[PDB]
Write a protein that binds this ligand. Sequence first.
Ligand code: CL
Ligand code: K
Lengths: 330, 33
Amino acid sequence: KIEKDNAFAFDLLQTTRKHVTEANVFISPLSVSMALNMTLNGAAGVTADEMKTALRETGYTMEDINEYSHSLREALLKVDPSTTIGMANSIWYKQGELVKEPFILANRTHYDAEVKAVDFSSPATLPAINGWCAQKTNDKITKILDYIPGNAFMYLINAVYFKGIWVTQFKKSDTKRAPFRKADGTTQEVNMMAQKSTFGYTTDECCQYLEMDYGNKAFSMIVMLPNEGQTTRDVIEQLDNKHWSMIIKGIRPTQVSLRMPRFKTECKYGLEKKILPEMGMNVPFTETADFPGITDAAIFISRVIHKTFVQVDEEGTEAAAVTAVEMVKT
Amino acid sequence: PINFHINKPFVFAIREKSTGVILFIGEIGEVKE
Ligand SMILES: [Cl-]
Ligand SMILES: [K+]
């Protein structure tokens, strides 16, 4: 049994925030870890060690990583029948290529991976792959790929889906037009939801913290609201396992007058460019990568595409993420 | 009651309690619909 914490989530958030310039950031560390853990089953030597370093899995064996992911995925799918949860994995590879059975069977066994041999040159393949993504995200992420390169060898794709209903919903009749001050200091008018209810609450030097439950209270949203003059950049930079543990343990049921905007965001990342290299994953993205667990062919990771969606409203939250690890032949 | 008025940028996360896993995490600097 491995006691894996949320270090990867905080490191991925911090590194993504450092490199992207957009006002909004929205990621699924779970989706990224699951797709890269499928891929890691084929890696040897420094390729494998650099992937474990980036994933914050150094010192864990592949057997323990696989068994942890398998147990985690099954627990998330059954902990709350009143919340919709989707966890789907698929492997798509070039028809006619030989892919090793221990690698495929490790992924079928521990990730319930759907495995398909496809002709990447067919006009039908992009709709088949993108159609799978739409099917596993309630059509909220309808494309993960815009093109397939000529040297494509394999896609390892994960889709995470979430649709929760607030334990205490907002009344649509209580939503009002109100200002929201943007990251650049300018103001926009938004649909500000409001309610007075019992919520989990705590504070520290920087911020106020709120916990809003969904369904049977297995899942919740944590909101970190910096005090006046404080920034979200500082909150992100100072967020680690120690700090998160202190926030969670400090939460107490409190009567709160909540004001929250209706909001939606859709984000797209190429994690191979700067983020995963900074986290320690370098060699797997180069021609010196070694994936002998997958094939005898010389392959490497060309892109790690991460796309997300979130919509928050009076009823609850809908969120989705897709991560595609694109492997190409050198 | 305590006021928790989200009228400026914030960080948020969707978590599951028994596993403690963060499924999603982000920051909102601009509201979109
Ligand atoms: Cl990016
Ligand atoms: K980048």
